[model samples]
Target: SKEYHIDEEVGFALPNPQENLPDFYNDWMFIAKHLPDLIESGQLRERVEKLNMLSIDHLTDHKSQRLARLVLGCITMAYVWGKGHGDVRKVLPRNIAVPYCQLSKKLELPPILVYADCVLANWKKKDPNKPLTYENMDVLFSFRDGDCSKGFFLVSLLVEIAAASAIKVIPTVFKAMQMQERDTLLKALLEIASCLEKALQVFHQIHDHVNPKAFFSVLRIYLSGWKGNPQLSDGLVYEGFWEDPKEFAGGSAGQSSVFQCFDVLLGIQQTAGGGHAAQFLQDMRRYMPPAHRNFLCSLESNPSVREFVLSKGDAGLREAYDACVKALVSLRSYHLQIVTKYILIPASQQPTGGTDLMNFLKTVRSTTEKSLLKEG
Candidate 1:
């Protein structure tokens, strides 16, 4: 039902995150290319304030629009967080505000940056003729002017890649249900489980690369949004857009549609205890690409693998479905571990896009754990 296609290779990822903008956007491109340096030297706001507003009329295609979003989103995050807490800017000038908000509406995303802007639309191959992998991919823009920050984005890119295996089997799961092919459904669920485990392996590599100190002190703030942030409790104002101000959550791994797709495909329903935490994820779906989010919705409207398995009471099918849940719980649990070092303990009990960090993961994992086939 959605306008997007899930390719055998790229899956949900935007095939090309368009590394270049047209010549007309030279000023914006210059700032994007030098963003890390500008942010480091405290000259970003000065340059943006001096450049004046540029029309988005030339962004006629999706590639141009996406590139503009990435460049503008990065600049916006740097401007708001370039300084640090206790000195946040209250209003965004029209020069940056007008086009950014317009681009947001055009793309059906919040004006603030999201996972798609930084992760889905941020990578480029190191060589024109190589495969996409952690070693082969590089970020089009980085928060800091060094390789250290690249680890955060690049590792995330691989996680999406790792999930391609799961996305590829979606049609098979649907077919098996329609045809009552119990063995076929078992095959699809097994593939999904193995791929999720692959994604977990890719996710664990973040510890090997991203330093907790640099992330907590320098990189993480740039990704923060005003909604739940204490520093901007009232939210950020866009001078030309509206006087009411806008609030959106920071970029979060929760925005990924991969696991959510698995949850739906396997019919992993949430329990009542994690209502608040579950809604946080439900809200994050709006941060996804329009087609990708619709893809999840389309799955919900159809018969779930869980429904098919539960009806048959086939031992192999039930075991396969539980294995998918187990894989997902491990990945979500490891996510808790990563946050423990990178944000929770670093902030000394603080959080991201939530009122509580540890509790968010606890509620999320416990909620998924309850979805097990044999659970009460």
Candidate 2:
């Protein structure tokens, strides 16, 4: 009943997503196409101000609307952060904020740049004739550090490609559990584990194009939200839209719904961390596609893989469960290392997710490892 087709595209990262909004947003389209250029010339916020307060009426479907949200989200970020950290903005203009907030409500996403907007829905292939790969891929919008943004966004997109299979298996895992089909469940677990590994491989490939120094210094700032960050603390007022300041977290990695699906499927609960880390992960669910988040919620209310695995004393069951859990842990570990290189090594600052970054990630990895069953 949770409307989640255990088999719909969890954003196939797919061979294609909506590349552009339809012509009604042509004004926004011009701004989107010239985002990096506008930001560099200090014309982005000004260009945005001169734009119309467009309605979402022109967006007729999911892809069209998704395109609109992507355009608006990126524009909002560029408008706010384009001035750089020192001249920090405390408000979003009406022209951009109102349309974005409308779509955010309709699409069930937040009114800022999220992973779904920036990474999941941001990419397209350069050649319609070409099959997908790093070379063929490109982003719809980016910061002035276009290449770093491309690699940063695409590497995560590739990881989504890797995760599509894991997402596809949810129903199979559910049915297998219902049938008491241990073998089917075991196979599903291994398949998910393999998908996590493939995802990790693609994630590591990020180092190839995204220079860490530039990622931290020039790019990452734009992906940030006004919450818990010293640069734009308290909140940002959406001028002419909201009566008071509002805050939302930026595009953090945990915002990836695929990661949430994996956690739910394996029943890898994040119990060890004090409320701080666990709460942050739970809150990031707001950034996911609503259906995917609901799928996770639906997945939780049903029989879990962990419960089924523990029901049987078979060593085979334990290994199958542990295998998937370990894969998740490894992936999380790699992510922590990536943060070290990109965010930590570059310099110490609060992570974009608005938590004590290192502590939260360590708790996630530790809790996942603890889920492994062992009583020898």
Candidate 3:
């Protein structure tokens, strides 16, 4: 049995979301809504310094107890990259910075070092004239730092694995589409679907261990871009677009997919009117890293998947499409289960705050599930 423990550095090692449902979530939600303002106003560093001096042990319940860790993770990241200056002089005091790295190991998330050295640091080339290979991207995860390296590294590794698998079959499928080879295209779709399922399976392993607040708040905000909201003027903000605006990139949650290629191939329309589920999936992609997002877009540009499937007239092609859909639906079903365990069930059993988080998770689940693949 896996037991989550608390460390001085990491706060709660593995979060038990059910322990203190309402109070925990409420405090986290308040911070999520307001932290953006603090960052923008240049007051976050002062707040983080004071928070570092506070005691994590004084807090009661699982969720509320972990709030400090989430706060620290966000503020530290903001200090590093929140402003326009890349690699600004280190803002974290030794007391907070040292412990924050230790906490990252306990929680299985990547520390700031991995981000600086791997993602942010430009690698030197032996052959400067050569174009960067995807292999260079693969090498990023090989660096080791005991524990803090595993979580986020595993995440990127799984995604790259999925992408690598797709690379082998996509070009073949594209050719098959041009030649009107239904059987070849169908086989490619099935292979791509399996590849996606494997990636989602890896995600399942990390879901519980990851602190949802840290994930959804601090980390997730950087992964996000504006999703056509009226308040933000409905524009796409590229990740790493911070020149003077101080914007950061959000992550690819549901957006990065081999199956999405299948959907586009089969001409599955993600409409805004009644397709609430499809719409949700589209909105989530706003978080994917720009390069990955562009790759998926490039795949969609080819009409092979759609052309081949339509030419065959929906017999075997439909079966392969349905198979891909089933894999996706299964993954989303697991996500719903995790959401229930972490947020919904606990909130229901213990009434601490209003139905804010419960309702939020419920709505997200309901809308996303609506687009799940079902056999007719």
Candidate closest to the true structure, highest TM-score? 1
After superposition on all C-alphas, the RMSD of every candidate to the true structure, in Å, is 2.5, 2.9, 16.3
Regions of model 2 farther than 4 Å from truth:
1-15, 128-130, 271-274, 348-356
TM-score for each prediction? 0.93, 0.92, 0.46
lDDT of each: 0.81, 0.77, 0.44
Q: Clashing residue pairs in candidate 3, if any?
A: 10-103, 222-249, 222-250, 223-249, 223-250, 223-251, 224-250, 251-287
Highest lDDT model number: 1
Q: Which runs in model 1 stand beyond 4 Å of their true positions?
A: 271-274, 349-355
lDDT of 1 by residue, 231-307 (tens): 88888999878877778898876788887888777777742335777777788888998888888888888987776
Please report, as a residue range, the 10-residue window in candidate 1 with the lowest summed lDDT: 348-357
Better model by lDDT: candidate 1 vs candidate 3? 1
Worst 10 residues of 2 by lDDT: 5-14
| Candidate 2: tens digits of C-alpha lDDT, residues 1-376 | 2255233443434235687677778898888888777877877777887888888887887778777888888788888787465666788878778888888989888888888778877888788787657998888888785438988888888878778767777788889888878889889878877877777788778889789878888777788788877777778998877899888988866687676677777787763245777788788888887776777788788877887788778788788778778888888888888888887767755445524678878877887788888722
Runs with alpha carbons beyond 4 Å of true place in candidate 3: 1-160, 207-262, 274-290, 304-307, 310-314, 345-376
What is the Cα-based lDDT of residue 330 in candidate 1?
Answer: 98
* Local error of candidate 2 at residue 267 (angstroms): 1.6
